[PDB]
């Protein structure tokens, strides 16, 4: 799953709504 | 949108040169400031997190068959929690890493496509946030060295 793969590559791309 | 294409091509050209793809390839002041700030931010990002985007084309199956909407789908995961300047920098750095890797793996055809994909993604997905958050002149104020 591309989406899963992507999520791995960008694990550190998290944060808030704001 | 033309300025978005130019920013993408400036950044990717910079990253390819910096890695020494001057030889895999046959060889305003307001916008200059934007380009320089983005180059420096992308360098900073890469110095901070350079394990982050290794072996991309393999993990993401980016090939000469890949269509824009697969790139879009991947990048959407980067902005899953919303857009900010740090993730926009990450986006540019990702694209740069994809370009370098593509050249390294003898898939040079991808460089012009990645640049088109980034410009589209910027215009359609990121520009609406940018134009609510001060535009690139505000990015310069935040991340420009000077």
Author numbering:
A (entry chain B): 570 to 587
B (entry chain A): 2 to 28, 80 to 198
What does the paper behind this entry write?
To ensure that the VDAC1-N peptide remains stably bound to BclxL, we produced a single-chain construct where VDAC1-N (1–26) is fused to the C-terminus of BclxLΔLT (lacking its flexible loop and the transmembrane helix after residue 209). This construct allowed for crystal formation of suitable quality for a high-resolution structure determination by X-ray diffraction. The general binding mode between BclxL and VDAC1-N is reminiscent of BH3 peptides, e.g., as seen in the BclxL-Bak-BH3 complex. However, the binding site of VDAC1-N is shifted toward the periphery of the BclxL binding groove yet overlapping with the BH3 site. The C-terminal tail of VDAC1-N loosely binds to BclxL in an extended conformation, which is not seen for BH3 peptides. In our X-ray structure, VDAC1-N forms an amphipathic helix with the side chains of Leu10, Ser13, Asp16, Val17, and Phe18 facing the BclxL binding groove. To validate the structural model of the complex, we performed alanine scanning experiments where every individual residue in the binding region of VDAC1-N was mutated to alanine, followed by NMR-detected affinity measurements with each peptide. These experiments showed a strong impact of residues that participate in binding to BclxL, with the L10A mutation having the biggest impact (~20-fold reduction in affinity). Leu10 is the only large hydrophobic residue in VDAC1-N that is establishing a hydrophobic interaction with the BH3 binding groove in BclxL, thus markedly contributing to the overall binding affinity.
